[PDB]
Amino acid sequence: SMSQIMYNYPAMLGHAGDMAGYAGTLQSLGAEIAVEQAALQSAWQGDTGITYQAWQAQWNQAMEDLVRAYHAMSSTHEANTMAMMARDTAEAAKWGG
Amino acid sequence: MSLLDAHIPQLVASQSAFAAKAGLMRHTIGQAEQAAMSAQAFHQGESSAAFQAAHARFVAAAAKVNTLLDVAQANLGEAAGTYVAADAAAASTYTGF
């Protein structure tokens, strides 16, 4: 617990713009490539490495984690209310120290 | 009763939209990463572990999107004709229990 250190008010903790959008933007971006390649499936070879089925699943699985990687830093967004004890989601659930 | 140029496309395939899309992806990340910088102006120093992990997580996933963008064009052919003989450790990956 480190709240009596130097955290008077929620200055940095919390939100400050639209970061959630920047990340989600990647997901929608990849969807375009996934649907595009789907139209040229017949052109796909498959004897070079990745297949049409593998690429589809792999891609989605990639973009998914690729986006979260950006939200990771913004994870502190909810950390704001965390200061409250009434809720207690990551605190009561935590087990470190 | 021959219909010459009525409801047919033009420069829709020869131009290769796939390629234009692949490059549009990196654009989202390149520009997005810049945003995180402007906000990092908080104090402007060097120390940043919490942010490091998040920063490394993104680049770690990018390898999946980039590698998939090459195989897609290489397998589709018409999509694009390029390669990246750089190799990496992320290309191997690993899974436990």
From Swiss-Prot, chain A:
Belongs to the WXG100 family. ESAT-6 subfamily. It comes from Mycobacterium tuberculosis (strain ATCC 25618 / H37Rv). The lineage of its organism: Bacteria, Bacillati, Actinomycetota, Actinomycetes, Mycobacteriales. It is found in: Secreted. Changing residue 15 to A: No change in activity. The gene is esxH. Gene3D superfamilies: ESAT-6-like. This is ESAT-6-like protein EsxH. One of its GO terms (cellular component) is phagocytic vesicle lumen. To improve expression in E.coli the proteins were cloned as a single protein in the order esxH-esxG with a cleavable thrombin tag. GO terms for molecular function: metal ion binding. Zn(2+) binds at residues 15, 71, 77-78.
UniProtKB/Swiss-Prot annotation, chain B:
It is found in: Secreted. GO terms for cellular component: cytosol; extracellular region; phagocytic vesicle lumen. Keywords: Acetylation, Secreted, Virulence. Gene3D superfamilies: ESAT-6-like. The modification N-acetylserine is found at residue 2. InterPro entries: ESAT-6-like_sf, T7SS_ESAT-6-like. EsxG, in complex with EsxH, disrupts ESCRT function and impairs host phagosome maturation, thereby promoting intracellular bacterial growth. The complex acts by interacting, via EsxH, with the host hepatocyte growth factor-regulated tyrosine kinase substrate (HGS/HRS), a component of the ESCRT machinery. EsxG stabilizes EsxH in the host cytosol. To improve expression in E.coli the proteins were cloned as a single protein in the order esxH-esxG with a cleavable thrombin tag. Belongs to the WXG100 family. CFP-10 subfamily. Forms a tight 1:1 complex with EsxH. This is ESAT-6-like protein EsxG. The lineage of its organism: Bacteria, Bacillati, Actinomycetota, Actinomycetes, Mycobacteriales.
